[PDB]
RNA sequence: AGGGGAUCGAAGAUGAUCAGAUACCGUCGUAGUCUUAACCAUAAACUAUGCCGACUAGGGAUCGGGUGGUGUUUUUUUAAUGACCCACUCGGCACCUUACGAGAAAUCAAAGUCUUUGGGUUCUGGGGGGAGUAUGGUCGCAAGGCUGAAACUUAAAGGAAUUG
């Protein structure tokens, strides 16, 4: 099997967490990045890592991934945020119940009227 | 260096709260022992008991060590902490800390005359824990602590000059007995007497006052 | 031994002593 | 069968308090319940109360403040002997500085302290603190 | 719950209860003047008869006994007082 | 303390009857709600929306009243709440908890999810039961969006609405946001429909 | 100690139900404690039904199952049929599938 | 109330039942039956003086292996016969 | 809890639950203190100035936290027909 | 003591298995199993949990009774019936969820309202064996039931839960 141990997956997380600008979809440079940007004790463990931190990278591009939040998303989430122009005052009148009406008449005032009956 | 976590921890070294009485007033959940350290330094340690326990293991027989510790001044504040560890030192180390966090107030009182400085309790009180019931009775002055050596010490450390005691249960099992004698003294600032019927305006929360001088960044 | 087999054990025992004693009536 | 009409009112009062209520309705009231009810109220362990009148034995609604931990009843109305009133309070009151043992004496239902001042004694029935 | 007016219960929650568990107890049956327009006069019946109430002059019938409330017979009118 | 004009207005009521906030629960109906109002025949119970609108006001009257508007936490595990809360938080002080809560966030400093707020607002104490449970381990007031079958234990001030889905939750959260900015904060004089659309606090698709 | 609130099985307010005889070992066993099963199955079987219809008169006929209610003795009910044995909790659950 | 009569005249039942139940007390029943004076090799008395019949070598119960050294004595006020132990190292060499 | 002469001996006079007038002790880390806001004319909400209420851990556990506050705030004149003393 | 005696079947007899196999499995089958007239009076006769009264907390089912409904369905000409549906209310057999509370726990709307120890009343237990034995009394045709000790011995026996 080729399941990456935690130490690799843990480390990839930590690096994407705080170096998403820098880092790439390219392993080859992600490799070199790891040298400057982190101490590792063996060439094997580094590529093992950088390969996977590239993987995680390559698919953040296609949507978020649980476990990694470099803040830059939570604000992307708010500026990518808006909708509406229609609401739910058209058309005509609020349709209510017999007693929903009675609720109105027994506290408030102005209301377009529209009743119904319901069955067992 | 300290470095507190928790809002409340920060406020303390911030010198913006002065006594636990405050903390108790608003029932503030303590989480950081140095809070009760810098608040009440006169605290002294008493190791009450160490007894072996044994777990069987799918490859081993862990026998770690359970230590019971009581901390207090002798002026209205006790603690009861219990911890088991692989070493007795470690058990005693951790125990004192938990006993710090646990620290409660005691409501002492007068046997039955208004005279100089409360020496006994406020009411009879009962604490239970497991099978042991410990029952504390207000006693005249110079009666002393009428209780078995352990409970006599837990009481002493909370600063009780004269009480009577009575116990029901398998008292031999120290752990539960002291835990019940603990519950007993905790129950003094629960029991509502006439002298506390008068209404108080209801104080403002330290976390809202020095809100600023708490808070993270 | 099973309780009920012991209950039977001594039921018999009394019958013999019940017997031997009659001998002397 | 209903055996002590005091016992029931008292317990009701206590179960209400315990559960954080402010009012009981007790049934079925009597001269004694009232007098007992009246004695607690005199030292403020309950608010006001009302006798509602079923054309029967009665009902009572009590209003509770929360100042009350316990109101018990002494089931056989033992004789107390003016000397022995001390031994009772000691047995079953939290301290010597408050709480009352209430009892029925030749000259009225009254808490032990009043009983002391008036120099009468009699039978014992209940207590408050 | 926790604080309520036991002294002034609401007419409805009061009404739905049992005839003995109301505030002060009292019946929930009623009486009625009853006429079967063969005759002219009005005999006063109990809502929970038991006896099959024999009318005044004409031994016609009137109501029948039931579980609780009497079943009035055929063509008859009433009023609760 | 009574305001004067903070009565339930025309357009307010209209908003709530289009959200169907007044549609309370069915043959399920918690003992502890007189927030009801005459049983709708065949199932539903109708909710006194004034009582709703009033509770909402308390809600606002207590949210604003926290010195640092950010340690006023707004949680929702339910999806129909998530889109609302994030939008509630953004608009006010408040910190948001959408989706998973992660237990030991109020107990246990050590946890990286750690908080320590002065107040909690929750949308459905069934699903978010964790939060309500946790706050009671460490004295923290709680504000709740409740239905007629919600578990009122350990929540002070309910807001009797309709977590039966749709728009209600958002609607309520919006109004919540609306009144806390109106309160002590930058907003307006009279009615003033507020720029922001209520569909901004809405569950999306597909 | 005790192990089930339904003690053995299903008798609250009765004192005596009546024994049935285990379908497998003929052990007597109270009808309420009895482990039962409707053995609704076809007369034919799996793939015999093709041959059935084909070498028959009429069209398609009807085909009527056998029905017979089964009673097992616990030990039998455990030894093969419905039983397994469940966790302390999974025991509590009375839903079938 | 669980059990015991609470009433104000129920004092007779309350004593009787106590008389009754005392018998389940070991030393009360020993005392009142006079088990002392009747069984017991001594009189009921603190010590008793007898005469030495044979010298015994009683082997000890497990997990203890030893030979315990005793004397059969025949009590003088009694003729009741009794085996008794002879404490400390040697000492059996004192008797005869 | 005074003494022989004046002198307020014995520290700490605890808060009582606004709803039950029972003591709110220390390890009661499930009790709660709510601040409701003093306000002025035309919205606005006078910071630092609250009308405050305190509810015991018991009460909140029992579910009565809402209802009981409804009463308390309303008959302090800050709820307008929400509660009802009769049932 | 009569009748009955299909079935199944203590005893007994056999076939087998087994080192043995007085058994488990197979066969034969006495008594018995059923009933009448008398006995016997015991079961883990169990909820291993006295009865009467009060109080304390939520939820959906169901059983019997009753009340309310310009409810549904039955058609005939609409009712009247009947069954069904919804709300409430008494009294049942139970279950669910919680626990303020209780407990050594397992668990418990009672096993709750108990060192803050008293509603009324009945009954039984007081370390383990010895032993439900000996003895006396009594009931029984019997088998046996009820009542029921001691000497002597002994440091544990026992309960619930945990890890193995
Ligand atoms: Mg020791
Ligand atoms: Mg002869
Ligand atoms: Mg076991
Ligand atoms: Mg077993
Ligand atoms: Mg039976
Ligand atoms: Mg005995
Ligand atoms: Mg010899
Ligand atoms: Mg002589
Ligand atoms: Mg035969
Ligand atoms: Mg044979
Ligand atoms: Mg053979
Ligand atoms: Mg044989
Ligand atoms: Mg028996
Ligand atoms: Mg059973
Ligand atoms: Mg119920
Ligand atoms: Mg009907
Ligand atoms: Mg030994
Ligand atoms: Zn007529
Ligand atoms: Zn079987």
Model description:
The structure is cut from a larger assembly and holds 9 protein chains of 9 kinds. Helices cover 44% and strands 0% of the residues of chain A. Chain A has 5 helices and no strands. Chain A has helices at 6-19, 27-37, 43-58, 76-79, 98-105. The radius of gyration of chain A is 28 Å and the shape is rod-shaped. The N and C termini of chain A lie far apart (61 Å). Chain C has one helix spanning 3-22. By secondary structure, chain C is an all-alpha fold. The longest helix of chain C has 20 residues, at 3-22. Chain C has 1 helix and no strands. With 81 residues, chain E is mostly beta strands. Chain E has one domain. Chain E is built from 1 helix and 4 strands. Chain E has one helix at residues 11-15; strands at residues 31-34, 43-46, 63-64, 71-72. In chain E, a hairpin with a 6-residue loop joins β3 and β4. The termini of chain E are far apart. Chain G is α+β, with helices and mostly antiparallel strands. Chain G has one domain. In chain G, 18% of the residues lie in helices and 12% in strands. Chain G has 3 helices and 4 strands, in the order βββαβαα. Chain G has helices at 48-54, 75-79, 88-92, and strands at residues 19-21, 28-30, 36-38, 69-71. A two-stranded antiparallel sheet of chain G has the order 1-2. Chain G has a two-stranded antiparallel ribbon with strand order 3-4. The longest helix of chain G is centred in the middle third of the chain and has 7 residues, at 48-54. In chain G, 9% of the residues are buried. Chains in contact: A-F, B-D, B-F, B-I, D-E, D-H, D-I, E-I, F-I. The complex binds magnesium ion (MG) (17 copies) and zinc ion (ZN) (2 copies). One magnesium ion (MG) binds at residues 15-16 of chain G. Chain D binds one RNA strand of 164 nucleotides through residues 1-9, 11-12, 14-16, 18-20, 24, 27, 69-70, 72-76, 78, 91-94, 129.
List keywords for this structure.
part of a larger assembly, 9 chains, E: mainly beta, two-stranded antiparallel ribbon, 1 helix, elongated, G: 97 residues, alpha+beta, binds magnesium ion, binds zinc ion, RNA-binding, Small ribosomal subunit protein eS32A (chain C), cytoplasm (chain C), ribosomal protein (chain C), Ribosomal_eS32 (chain C), ribonucleoprotein (chain C)
How much of the residues of chain C is beta strand, in percent? under 5%
Element pattern of chain C in H and E: H
Strand content of chain D: 15-25%
- Gyration radius of chain C (Cα, Å) is 11 Å
Oligomer: part of a larger assembly
Looking at the structure, what is the overall shape of chain C?
Answer: rod-shaped
Number of helices of chain C: 1
Helix content of chain C: over 70%
Summed up, the helix count of chain D is 4
Main sheet overview of chain C: none
Rg of chain D, nearest Å: 14 Å
| Strands side by side in the biggest sheet of chain D | 4-7-5-6
Counting helices, strands and paired strands, the structural category of chain C is: mainly alpha
Summarize the amount of helix of chain D as a percent range. Answer: 25-40%
Zinc finger (C4-type) (chain E): 36-58
Keywords (chain E): Cytoplasm, Metal-binding, Methylation, Ribonucleoprotein, Ribosomal protein, Zinc, Zinc-finger
Subcellular location (chain E): Cytoplasm
Family (chain E): Belongs to the eukaryotic ribosomal protein eS27 family.
């Amino acid at each position: 099997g080729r399941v990456r141990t935690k130490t690799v997956k843990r480390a990839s997380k930590a690096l994407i967490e705080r170096y998403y600008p820098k880092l790439t979809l390219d392993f080859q440079t992600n490799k070199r990045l790891c040298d400057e940007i982190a101490t590792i004790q063996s060439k094997r463990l580094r590529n093992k890592i950088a390969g996977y931190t590239t993987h995680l990278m390559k698919r953040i591009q296609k949507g978020p991934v649980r476990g990694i939040s470099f803040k830059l998303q939570e604000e992307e989430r708010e500026r990518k945020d808006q909708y509406v122009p229609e609401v739910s005052r058209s058309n005509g009148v609020l349709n209510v119940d017999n007693q929903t009406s009675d609720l109105v008449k027994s506290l408030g005032l102005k209301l377009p009227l529209s009743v119904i009956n319901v069955s067992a | 260096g300290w470095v507190p976590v928790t809002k409340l921890g920060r406020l303390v070294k911030a010198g913006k709260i002065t006594t636990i009485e405050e903390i108790f007033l608003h029932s503030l959940p303590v989480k950081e022992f140095q809070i009760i350290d810098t608040l009440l330094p006169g605290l002294q340690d008493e190791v009450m008991n160490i007894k072996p326990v044994q777990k069987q293991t799918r490859a081993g027989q862990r026998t770690r060590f359970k230590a019971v510790v009581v901390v207090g001044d002798s002026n209205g504040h006790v603690g009861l902490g219990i911890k088991t560890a692989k070493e007795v030192a470690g058990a005693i180390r951790a125990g004192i800390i938990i006993a710090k966090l646990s620290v409660i107030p005691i409501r002492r009182g007068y046997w039955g005359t208004n005279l100089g400085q409360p020496h006994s309790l406020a009411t009879k009180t009962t604490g239970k824990c497991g099978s042991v019931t410990v029952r504390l009775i207000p006693a005249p002055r110079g009666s002393g602590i009428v209780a078995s050596p352990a409970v006599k010490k837990l009481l002493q450390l909370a600063g009780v000059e004269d009480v009577y005691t009575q116990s029901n249960g398998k008292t031999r099992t120290l752990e539960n007995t002291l835990k019940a004698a603990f519950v007993a003294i905790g129950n003094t600032y629960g029991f509502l007497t006439p002298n506390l019927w008068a209404e108080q305006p209801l104080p403002v929360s330290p976390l809202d006052i020095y809100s600023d001088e708490a808070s993270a960044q | 031994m099973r309780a009920k087999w012991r209950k039977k054990r001594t039921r018999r025992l009394k019958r013999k002593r019940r017997k031997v004693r009659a001998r002397s009536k | 069968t209903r055996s002590s009409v005091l016992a029931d009112a008292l317990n009701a009062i206590n179960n209400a308090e315990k559960t954080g209520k402010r009012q009981v309705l007790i049934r079925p009231s009597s001269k004694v319940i009232i007098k007992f009810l009246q004695v607690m109220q005199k030292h403020g362990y309950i608010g006001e109360f009302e006798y509602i009148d079923d054309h029967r034995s009665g009902k009572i609604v009590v209003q509770l403040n929360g100042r009350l931990n316990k109101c018990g009843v002494i089931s056989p109305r033992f004789n107390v002997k003016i000397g022995d009133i001390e031994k009772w309070t000691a047995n079953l009151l939290p301290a010597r500085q408050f709480g009352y043992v209430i009892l029925t004496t030749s000259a009225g239902i009254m808490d032990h302290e009043e009983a002391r001042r008036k120099h009468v004694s009699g039978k014992i029935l209940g207590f408050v603190y | 719950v926790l604080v309520q007016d036991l002294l002034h219960p609401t007419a409805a929650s009061e009404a739905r209860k049992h005839k003995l568990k109301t505030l002060v107890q009292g019946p929930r049956s009623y009486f009625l003047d009853v006429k079967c327009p063969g005759c002219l006069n009005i005999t006063t019946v109990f809502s929970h008869a038991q006896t099959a109430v024999t009318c005044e002059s004409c031994s016609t019938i009137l109501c029948t006994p039931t579980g609780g409330k009497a079943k009035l017979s055929e063509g008859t009118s009433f009023r609760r007082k | 303390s009574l305001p004067a004009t903070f009565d339930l207005t025309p357009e307010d009521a209209q908003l709530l009857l289009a959200a169907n906030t007044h549609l309370g629960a069915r043959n399920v109906q918690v003992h502890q709600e007189p927030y009801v109002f005459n049983a709708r025949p065949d199932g539903v119970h109708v909710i006194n929306v004034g009582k709703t609108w009033e509770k909402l006001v308390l809600a606002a009257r207590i949210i604003a009243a926290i010195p640092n508007p950010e340690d006023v936490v707004a949680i929702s595990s339910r999806t129909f709440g998530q889109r609302a809360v994030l939008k509630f938080a953004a608009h006010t002080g408040a910190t948001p908890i959408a989706g998973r809560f992660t237990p030991g966030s109020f107990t246990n400093y050590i946890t990286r999810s750690f908080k320590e707020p002065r107040l909690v607002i929750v949308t459905d104490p069934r699903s978010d039961a964790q939060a309500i449970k946790e706050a009671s381990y460490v004295n923290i007031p709680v504000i709740a969006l409740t239905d007629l079958d919600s578990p009122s234990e350990f929540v002070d001030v309910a807001i009797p609405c309709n977590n039966r889905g749709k728009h209600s939750i958002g609607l309520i959260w919006y109004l919540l946001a609306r009144e806390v900015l109106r309160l002590r904060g930058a907003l307006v004089d009279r009615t003033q429909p507020w720029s922001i659309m209520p569909d901004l606090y809405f569950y999306r698709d597909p | 100690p005790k192990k089930r609130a339904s003690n053995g099985r299903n008798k609250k307010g009765r004192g005596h139900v009546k024994p049935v005889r285990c379908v497998n070992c003929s052990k007597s066993i109270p009808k309420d404690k009895a482990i039962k099963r409707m053995a609704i199955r076809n007369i034919v079987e799996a793939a015999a039904v093709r041959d059935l219809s084909e070498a028959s008169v009429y069209p398609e006929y009807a085909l009527p199952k056998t029905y017979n209610k089964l009673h097992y003795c616990v030990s039998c009910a455990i030894h093969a049929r419905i039983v397994r044995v469940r966790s302390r909790e999974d025991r509590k659950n009375r839903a079938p599938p | 109330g669980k059990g015991k009569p609470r009433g104000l005249n129920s004092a007779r039942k309350l004593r009787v039942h106590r008389r009754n139940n005392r018998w389940a007390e070991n030393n009360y029943k020993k005392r009142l039956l006079g088990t002392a004076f009747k069984s017991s090799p001594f009189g009921g008395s603190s010590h008793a003086k007898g005469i030495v019949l044979e010298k015994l070598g009683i082997e000890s119960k497990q997990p203890n292996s030893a030979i315990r050294k005793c004397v059969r004595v025949q009590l003088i006020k009694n003729g009741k016969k009794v085996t008794a132990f002879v404490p400390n190292d040697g000492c059996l060499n004192f008797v005869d | 809890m005074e003494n022989d002469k004046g002198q307020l001996v014995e520290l700490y006079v605890p808060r009582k639950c606004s709803a039950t007038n029972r003591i709110i002790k220390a390890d009661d880390h499930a009790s709660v203190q709510i601040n409701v806001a003093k306000v002025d004319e035309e919205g606005r909400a006078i910071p630092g100035e609250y009308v405050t209420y305190a509810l015991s851990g018991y009460v909140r556990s029992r579910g009565e936290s809402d209802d009981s506050l409804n009463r308390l705030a309303q008959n302090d004149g800050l709820l307008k027909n929400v509660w009802s003393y009769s049932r």
